[PDB]
């Protein structure tokens, strides 16, 4: 859910691509911007960057297509943030691994009175590197 202002500043950014103000970004305008920044992408690399975002198929990027893509990237950023925050909470002592002791304290806080045997089984299911603890990458895997 983009706010009004978020949209307003994504419109500003879009405007810096849409040089002639017609409401679309062509391959050539994309390449004008990138050469501004000291880059020199080929036509085929430019066309692929257009095609990544062209929901139409019509050759160009209108502001709605651009915003659509920026909202997806916002929602992806915001998911990860929530997952990363969850992990930090679970990792009580903040050493970057959830221990069985830490998982049991958290599980009770969700209203699940777990024994060590059940908690250790959770560890085992999550533990891809075998170290007996849940790292951040193992947590993210379980949350997908």
């Amino acid at each position: 859910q983009l706010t009004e202002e978020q949209i307003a500043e994504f419109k500003e950014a879009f405007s810096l691509f849409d040089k002639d103000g017609d409401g679309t970004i062509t391959t050539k305008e994309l390449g004008t911007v990138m050469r501004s920044l000291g880059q020199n992408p080929t036509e085929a690399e430019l066309q692929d960057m257009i095609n990544e975002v062209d929901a139409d198929g019509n050759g160009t990027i209108d502001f709605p297509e651009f915003l659509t893509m920026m909202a997806r990237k916002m929602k992806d950023t915001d998911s990860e943030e929530e997952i990363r925050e969850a992990f930090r909470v679970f990792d009580k002592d903040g050493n970057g691994y959830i221990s069985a002791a830490e998982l049991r304290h958290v599980m009770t806080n969700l209203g699940e009175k777990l024994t060590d045997e059940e908690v250790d089984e959770m560890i085992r299911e999550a533990d891809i590197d075998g170290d007996g603890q849940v790292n951040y990458e193992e947590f993210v895997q379980m949350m997908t």
Partner: peptide, 11 residues
């Protein structure tokens, strides 16, 4: 893990 998933989705 189920419930952890449920809970984090709920936020």
């Amino acid at each position: 893990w189920s419930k952890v998933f449920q809970k984090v989705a709920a936020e």
